[PDB]
Structure 1
Amino acid sequence: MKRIGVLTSGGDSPGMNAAIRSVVRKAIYHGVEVYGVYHGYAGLIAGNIKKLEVGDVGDIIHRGGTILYTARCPEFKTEEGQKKGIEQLKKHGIEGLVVIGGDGSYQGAKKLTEHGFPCVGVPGTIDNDIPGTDFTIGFDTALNTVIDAIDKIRDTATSHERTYVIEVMGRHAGDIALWSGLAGGAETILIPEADYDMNDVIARLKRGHERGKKHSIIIVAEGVGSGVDFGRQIQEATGFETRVTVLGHVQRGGSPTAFDRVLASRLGARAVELLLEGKGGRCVGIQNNQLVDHDIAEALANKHTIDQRMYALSKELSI
């Protein structure tokens, strides 16, 4: 392989620039030229391709976001879309692609390898719901942004303001809510996967108030419901003043923690090793503390699941 490309697709997340750096530096280390593709699959179709040199990934390791930008491109689902993209790859002499992003970025990688363009997928998301990896690049940074908010709520010492509702991200996966709730000492953790009883939530809240819990912290994933309406429901039902924090898109940004930059460096460099040794159609991951790589179609057929032992542990510690 003489010339490869790299691109980021889907929501951006902390650690995409450390994955771009390790892709670019490992490929240049073994004599290969790396072209950055700007604006995901939308810029692949448009021809927004520019050589990357060694020095262009200098000082991006510690930066959030992605310097190659991201964009939604529903035209890449279709056969017309893929042929316009391949024409731009052929025009610049790019023989392989490293694709950093979520589930939808892996669908394009699979379709490109079936049209003769070897591609590897690197899991870039804060949700943790990319199959074939225990941890996605960005998940550890998002947990550290939620627990910063939770620790600051722990300093309040106002007698009549003891009941806090924090709404975190997690439209389909409850990984951010569950690991944050456990790490934050949340009393009630509402995740998409588990069904909850509002009577159980109220009961526990009253039980903690009677034994003098200083703060009662409730975490709601955005996929279950809004914190605001949960907060009005708890105050109405109990008469405890309830404060709501809605973090929103703060969970996506920030300088990456040490675990996401080690992980993005390992995974980005492994994807270049896969392209250099003939393997295309695969996605890298970390499963059982080992660098692993799976065929994309096989990896995408598995479902995301949360650890149920961790969810039961979060209620036992919170009494």
Structure 2
Amino acid sequence: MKRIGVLTSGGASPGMNAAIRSVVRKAIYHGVEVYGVYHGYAGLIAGNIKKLEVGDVGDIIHRGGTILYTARCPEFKTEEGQKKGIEQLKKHGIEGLVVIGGDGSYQGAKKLTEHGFPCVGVPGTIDNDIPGTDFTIGFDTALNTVIDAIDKIRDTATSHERTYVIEVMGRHAGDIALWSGLAGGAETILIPEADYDMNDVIARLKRGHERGKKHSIIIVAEGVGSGVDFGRQIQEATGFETRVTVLGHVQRGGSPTAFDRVLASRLGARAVELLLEGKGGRCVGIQNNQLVDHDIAEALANKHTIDQRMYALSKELS
């Protein structure tokens, strides 16, 4: 390929810029041209396209967010929209596309290949909810953002404010909550992939309160419910003053950790390799500490799960 393109879609994840940097440098290394597609598939249809030079990625490896931006584009989820995209790619001489984003962005990667445009998906999201990869780019950073908040909460325990609820992201995937909860030494972790009894939870608060536990910290994945609601119900049920933190989109931001930069760099480069190998409709990932790549359709067909042992471990440790 003489020229490829790269875009980000699905909302920000720390390490997207590291991944863009890798795609650009890896391709330029092999003599390939790289074009930035701004604003995701929306910018693709709109022809918001511009060459990325070696220097254009020379100061971004440590930056959060994405220099290419992202934008939702339902228009691309249609035939006429995909056609506008294809047309814009051909007009710019772009022969293949690296798509960095969430599972949603993958669908578009697939369609493009079917119409003779090799596209490879790179997992950029904090959710860690993409099949065919143990870890998505940004998950590690989000975890550290979450434990930063948990650590600070540990300093604030008094006798009358001793119970804390922290709501983290994770609409369907409990990964953020589970890993954060374990690393944060949380007493209770509520996730969608595991059922919980609010009585067992309240019972656990009291047991801790009895043996003199300095603080009870409850981690709640957003997919399970509102931090505000859980906290209010707990206070209502126990008489214990309950304080609530809702991190929100903070979890998507900040400079990527070392693990995210490294993962981003490897997957990004791997994506370029696949295109040059003539492969397409593939997504990259890491599995058992090894770089893998799967057919998009096959990968998307699996169901994401969490490590139950780790969930169980977290209960033992508290």
Secondary structure in structure 2 of the residue aligned to 1:125:
coil
Q: Which runs of 5+ in 2 are unaligned?
A: none
The 1-side partners of 2:110 and 2:182 are apart by 36
Q: Secondary structure at the match of 1:71?
A: coil
| Structure 1 segments of 4+ aligned residues over 3 angstroms from their partners | none
Q: CA deviation at 1:256?
A: 0.3
Map 1:149-228 to 2 at 5 A. Answer: 149-228=149-228
For 1:2, the equivalent position in structure 2 comes to 2
In the alignment, the residues of structure 2 paired with residue 59 and residue 35 of structure 1 have an alpha-carbon distance, to the nearest angstrom, of 17
Task: Give deviations 1:18-56, integer Å, cap 9, x for gaps.
Answer: 000000000000000000000000000000000000000
Q: Counterparts of 1:233 and 1:186 in 2: how far apart (Å)?
A: 19
Alpha-carbon distance in structure 2 between the residues aligned to 1:180 and 1:301? 27
Structure 1: unaligned runs, 5 residues or longer: none
How much is the aligned-residue C-alpha RMSD, in angstroms?
Answer: 0.5
Secondary structure of the 2:123 match is strand
Query: Is the counterpart of residue 74 in structure 1 residue 60 in structure 2?
Result: no
Deviation at 1:255, TM superposition (A): 0.3
Alignment partner, residue 307 of structure 2: 307
1:254-287 Cα offsets, whole Å, 9 max, x none, are 0000000000000000000000010011000000
Instruction: Report how far residue 194 of structure 1 moved.
Output: 1.1
Deviations 1:148-168 (A, max 9, x none): 000000111411111000000
Q: Deviations over 1:79-102 (max 9, x none)?
A: 111101000000010000000001
- 2:172 is paired with a residue whose SS is coil
Whole-angstrom CA distance in 1 between matches of 2:270 and 2:157: 49
For 1:229 and 1:8, the matched residues in 2 are separated by 34
Provide the rounded CA distance (Å) in 2 between the counterparts of 1:167 and 1:238: 20
SS at the partner of 1:162? Answer: strand
Matched residue pairs, number? 318
- Give the structure 1 partner of residue 136 of structure 2: 136
Question: CA offsets per residue over residues 78-128 of structure 1, 9 Å max, x none?
Answer: 111110100000001000000000111100000000000000000000000
TM-score calculated relative to the size of structure 2: 0.99
TM-score by length of 1: 0.99
Give secondary structure in 2 for the equivalent of 1:137: coil
When residues 219 and 157 of structure 1 are mapped into structure 2, their CA distance, relative to the original with a 3 A threshold, is closer
Matched-pair identity in % = 100
Q: Residues of 2 paired with 1:270 and 1:195: CA distance?
A: 38
